[PDB]
Design a protein around this ligand. Structure first.
Ligand code: HEM
Ligand SMILES: [Mn+2]
Length: 153
């Protein structure tokens, strides 16, 4: 878990994302898809957008980016008390979408990358630590539901 000062760091960082969630959203997805091309194949609407330029030119991709970060903001504000919100997600990602936990690791690393890239010199060492921890927690709670379901990857 995180200390209250660590949660207060995470929610301070999140305020910066909220200035523009769609712009952050699209950047996260592009880092994901360009860094790990295998992840794109999981998206039936977007698997034709293989390069960063093609990705950028899709408003459908940006709206998907919005849905994702808005789900995650919602969860971060629960300061770890998120069992009712995480259950559906883990269930749909394991059984409908068939998303290995390794992809969740990719996307968590993509968020850190994007925060340093969009806010150079404004994303402190302390801030990085707290955000990393929150994302670990999120991934670990999902990993527990995946094991329940025997979702092997
Ligand atoms: C911060 C992590 C993530 C969040 C908050 C998130 C959230 C969501 C939400 C809210 C939906 C729509 C409802 C549903 O089907 O559950 C969704 C759909 C989906 N997610 Fe994620 N997701 C995350 C990570 C990922 C990753 C890493 C992948 C694949 C590499 C992925 C693949 C998909 C797919 C394929 C869909 C269905 C989209 C469609 O075709 O309509 N998700 N996700
Ligand atoms: Mn769809």
């Amino acid at each position: 878990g995180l200390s209250d000062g660590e949660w207060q760091q995470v929610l301070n960082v999140w305020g910066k994302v909220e200035a523009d969630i769609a712009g952050h959203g699209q950047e996260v997805l592009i880092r994901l898809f360009t860094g790990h091309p295998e992840t794109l194949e999981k998206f039936d609407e977007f698997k034709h957008l293989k390069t960063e330029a093609e990705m950028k030119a899709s408003e459908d991709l940006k709206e998907h980016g919005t849905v994702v970060l808005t789900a995650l903001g919602g969860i971060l504000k629960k300061k770890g008390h998120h069992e009712a919100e995480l259950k559906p997600l883990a269930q749909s990602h394991a059984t409908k979408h068939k998303i290995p936990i390794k992809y969740l690791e990719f996307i968590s690393d993509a968020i850190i990358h994007v925060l340093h890239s969009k806010h150079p010199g404004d994303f402190g060492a302390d801030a990085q630590g707290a955000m990393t921890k929150a994302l670990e927690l999120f991934r670990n709670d999902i990993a527990a539901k995946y094991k329940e379901l025997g979702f092997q990857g």
